[PDB]
Write an enzyme that holds these catalytic residues in place. Sequence first.
Site, PDB file in Angstrom:
ATOM      1  N   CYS A  42      38.919 -12.454 -69.710  1.00  0.00           N
ATOM      2  CA  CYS A  42      37.588 -12.805 -70.183  1.00  0.00           C
ATOM      3  C   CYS A  42      36.609 -13.051 -69.037  1.00  0.00           C
ATOM      4  O   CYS A  42      36.810 -13.956 -68.212  1.00  0.00           O
ATOM      5  CB  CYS A  42      37.608 -14.030 -71.112  1.00  0.00           C
ATOM      6  SG  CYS A  42      35.909 -14.503 -71.690  1.00  0.00           S
ATOM      7  N   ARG A 102      33.901 -16.691 -69.099  1.00  0.00           N
ATOM      8  CA  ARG A 102      34.470 -18.042 -69.026  1.00  0.00           C
ATOM      9  C   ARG A 102      33.567 -19.095 -68.413  1.00  0.00           C
ATOM     10  O   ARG A 102      33.878 -20.292 -68.535  1.00  0.00           O
ATOM     11  CB  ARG A 102      35.855 -18.042 -68.371  1.00  0.00           C
ATOM     12  CG  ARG A 102      36.971 -17.487 -69.303  1.00  0.00           C
ATOM     13  CD  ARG A 102      38.319 -17.404 -68.566  1.00  0.00           C
ATOM     14  NE  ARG A 102      38.435 -16.240 -67.688  1.00  0.00           N
ATOM     15  CZ  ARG A 102      39.330 -16.135 -66.700  1.00  0.00           C
ATOM     16  NH1 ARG A 102      40.193 -17.125 -66.482  1.00  0.00           N
ATOM     17  NH2 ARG A 102      39.387 -15.040 -65.944  1.00  0.00           N
ATOM     18  N   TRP A 160      29.423 -13.911 -77.718  1.00  0.00           N
ATOM     19  CA  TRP A 160      28.409 -12.868 -77.857  1.00  0.00           C
ATOM     20  C   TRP A 160      28.797 -11.669 -76.991  1.00  0.00           C
ATOM     21  O   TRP A 160      29.612 -11.796 -76.058  1.00  0.00           O
ATOM     22  CB  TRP A 160      27.019 -13.390 -77.486  1.00  0.00           C
ATOM     23  CG  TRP A 160      26.933 -14.036 -76.133  1.00  0.00           C
ATOM     24  CD1 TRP A 160      26.834 -13.409 -74.921  1.00  0.00           C
ATOM     25  CD2 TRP A 160      26.897 -15.445 -75.857  1.00  0.00           C
ATOM     26  NE1 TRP A 160      26.746 -14.346 -73.905  1.00  0.00           N
ATOM     27  CE2 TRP A 160      26.783 -15.603 -74.460  1.00  0.00           C
ATOM     28  CE3 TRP A 160      26.953 -16.588 -76.661  1.00  0.00           C
ATOM     29  CZ2 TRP A 160      26.727 -16.860 -73.850  1.00  0.00           C
ATOM     30  CZ3 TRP A 160      26.895 -17.836 -76.056  1.00  0.00           C
ATOM     31  CH2 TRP A 160      26.783 -17.964 -74.663  1.00  0.00           C
TER      32      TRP A 160
END
Lengths: 406, 404
Positions: A110, A113, A282
């Site tokens: 990710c 973060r 998002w």
Amino acid sequence: GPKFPRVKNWELGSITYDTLCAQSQQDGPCTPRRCLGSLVLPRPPAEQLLSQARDFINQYYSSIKRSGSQAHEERLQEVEAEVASTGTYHLRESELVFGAKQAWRNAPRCVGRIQWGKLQVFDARDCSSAQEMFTYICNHIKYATNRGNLRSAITVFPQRAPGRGDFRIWNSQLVRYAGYRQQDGSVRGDPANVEITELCIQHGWTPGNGRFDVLPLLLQAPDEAPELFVLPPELVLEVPLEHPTLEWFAALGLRWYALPAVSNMLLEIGGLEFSAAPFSGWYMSTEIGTRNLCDPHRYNILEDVAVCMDLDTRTTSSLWKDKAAVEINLAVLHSFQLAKVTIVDHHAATVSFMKHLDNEQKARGGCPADWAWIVPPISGSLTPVFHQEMVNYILSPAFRYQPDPW
Amino acid sequence: KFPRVKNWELGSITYDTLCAQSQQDGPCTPRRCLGSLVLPRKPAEQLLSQARDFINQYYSSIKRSGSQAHEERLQEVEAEVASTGTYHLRESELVFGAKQAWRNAPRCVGRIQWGKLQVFDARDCSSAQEMFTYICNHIKYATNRGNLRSAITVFPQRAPGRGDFRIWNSQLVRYAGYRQQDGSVRGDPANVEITELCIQHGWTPGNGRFDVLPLLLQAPDEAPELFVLPPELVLEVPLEHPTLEWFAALGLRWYALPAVSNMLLEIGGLEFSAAPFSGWYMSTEIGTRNLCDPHRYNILEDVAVCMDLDTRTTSSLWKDKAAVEINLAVLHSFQLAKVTIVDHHAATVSFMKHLDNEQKARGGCPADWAWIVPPISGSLTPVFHQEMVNYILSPAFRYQPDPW
Ligand code: HEM
Ligand code: HEM
Ligand SMILES: CNCc1cccc(OCc2ccc3ccc(N)nc3c2)c1
Ligand SMILES: CNCc1cccc(OCc2ccc3ccc(N)nc3c2)c1
Ligand SMILES: C[C@H](O)[C@H](O)[C@H]1CNc2nc(N)[nH]c(=O)c2N1
Ligand SMILES: C[C@H](O)[C@H](O)[C@H]1CNc2nc(N)[nH]c(=O)c2N1
Ligand SMILES: [Zn+2]
């Protein structure tokens, strides 16, 4: 000097050492003989539960600075007692919140973060039916979407229980476009979604026939057949794509949904497994613009856009793919901004990640990161993360892949 | 066991069984993956085993395994090592060894070409002056008036208790980087250090952005010597754009020959500390990395302003738009000058065909995903969607420390 991985940023010449990796209690797929870092998906006994539980409770008490205290030792004895009589145990609400956030913070793939501390945790551990799951999900979508001003959230349904069936959401995301196999062999809509679409049909969904039909939810409460739920259209916010200078781009009729809400991952905390725990943030623009719209095995619109731009598609060296791809990404960014729906470009995202890496260096002595996933799928070396070496490793709490329920 | 390897665009699966032939460790352990790191953190029976393995590869390659010639050559090697602690390769073994090292190079996207490699044996070199002659010939052959030809020149192997033959430059052709005392650098910042070493060994420096460096050549246990390359040997391509007429006005240019000269060639336990090799450029190396990297010539903002792009914000993708025009200029200009070059799309396409050839041939192919996937337009190339297994096979190219 130090006995830890040395990590270099080649743009800036700066050096760090990752000490955090020493807290990994789970093996990855690599060995000294071969690196398997590029693979997407490489391949309880109360003693094993307890050590994981203890580890997490230590993590929790450390985070609130009460490590070694009376309340710490009591929580430890309580968890051991709980397990001793029931085979499992239960999380306090504030423990659940800390775990859910630590799981996001621990996720190597990710790039978002920087935001990990701002996660809204909805406790849905009281849910007892598929109807109720639908209610919780709708609420999540509503809260998370917030009319375009998107808010990170996760909704946590009851944990796996010994001698009882799992809570599962069959869809890979809460919002997904249907993929209809055509009689010629091709696919209308999203080919990524062929299997889930056909599962919805078998379970009684009357199918559409557009390139952008929102799928119904298939929700499974314990020991029961999954039930079908149509999302009320007004809850599902979508953005029509147009381009700021290419006036014809709007005529393509492309669009995407606002909310990226992943729903098939397993959230693991202290040895407890939450098989249904959808979460949402998002989009980064390259997810929609490059992957979902241009992947050859997805919507595959590159050649179509290139033809409209009147590029030379008979030769690689015209860089028609690169040219089309940039314009598609620009259209995604421009349309989302115009619609006032939160989005982040791959430059601002990666810059924010470098800041995240600097924070975690100080806070934890490192940050697990999967370079191949962190680097964007276009403009790689133009973002700072490309020149940053990274160390990849599994920490817990963790989000994990899990087998499809069928 | 053996890794299951999937291509996510086509849904097809292979198994790498070649990796079981790896006998040297990479940086990863099951606790953590260090695959994105650029550089590694850091007797006679060992030499004999590596030697025996290589000789076996060689006689297998020519389909004469078990022959009398095979058995004798193993005894020759064993006799040399027992007596002298080392041994020497025959030219044919060396030619094979060099090609295998290229074939085994996990970071190289150009390996479809691996069997077509011209090998110059310079192992009878005794001085820096001689190395210069060999280097000039290499460049002449490889350049071939724009029709580039892959080549390698191999200088004497390392020997116990003697300094190494070394070429101090990282590549045979490199642009100077002059550090102005007001922080900035004129030229290529990657080369500031080598530029300074040249100056104190007596080079008269220029002050341009594209001054070709002299070569520092070192014969064992001697100070290196300075040699200016004959300007006619160094082919350069001036950059222009097919549609943006102002682009030529930027004065940009690059050299035709990518000729790496600081890597170590290991064959059968023998180490060749000076073994420069060259092929041809893939356009992204010049357009994206050399000209657009923030710590290199860093021209993105300049080109962006010329294109009247909105430099104020990232969300206008000015960086991406300028980068594409620069790579396009490189392709156009090399093609206009009739100099060999391959774009990243053609290159990755040929690499896929190579993965497939190698699957049938050897049961796998070592590849470093982070290096194979181009620095722009990653997922628009087939290699992006292909899983890859990384490991070390011998013969091999390796990094080695800077000789200063
Ligand atoms: C807030 C804005 C966020 C952004 C911009 C963001 C960005 C991304 C991106 C670009 C990826 C790569 C996925 C792909 O290429 O398919 C990713 C992966 C991931 N994200 Fe984030 N994310 C955000 C929020 C979150 C949240 C709220 C969570 C969980 C609480 C999360 C957990 C994960 C996990 C577990 C993965 C790996 C998925 C996998 O391995 O398949 N992200 N994120
Ligand atoms: C013929 C056309 C060739 C092309 C198009 C090509 C392409 C490339 C590219 C794009 C890279 C990444 C380099 C970077 O980003 O700096 C690379 C690396 C590499 N190439 Fe090739 N190459 C070619 C020929 C050769 C030859 C002849 C050899 C040696 C005999 C070779 C050996 C290597 C090695 C060892 C690396 C890794 C270098 C490192 O780790 O720093 N290549 N190649
Ligand atoms: C195809 N790779 C596996 C796979 C399948 C389905 C969805 C998915 O997306 C992962 C994912 C997870 C969380 C995210 C959060 C925010 C965001 N913008 N993208 C995110 C993307 C990944
Ligand atoms: C790890 N240092 C990176 C570094 C430093 C110096 C030169 C270099 O070039 C790598 C390289 C090696 C061989 C090549 C062959 C052909 C080609 N087009 N590029 C090639 C590029 C790479
Ligand atoms: C083979 C390779 O691992 C695969 O295509 C990966 C590469 N990097 C990725 N990076 C992100 N963010 N998402 C992905 O799905 C992938 N796919
Ligand atoms: C940190 C990262 O591994 C490093 O920047 C790598 C990434 N991939 C690369 N790929 C190529 N071809 N060349 C490079 O120098 C690099 N650099
Ligand atoms: Zn690894």
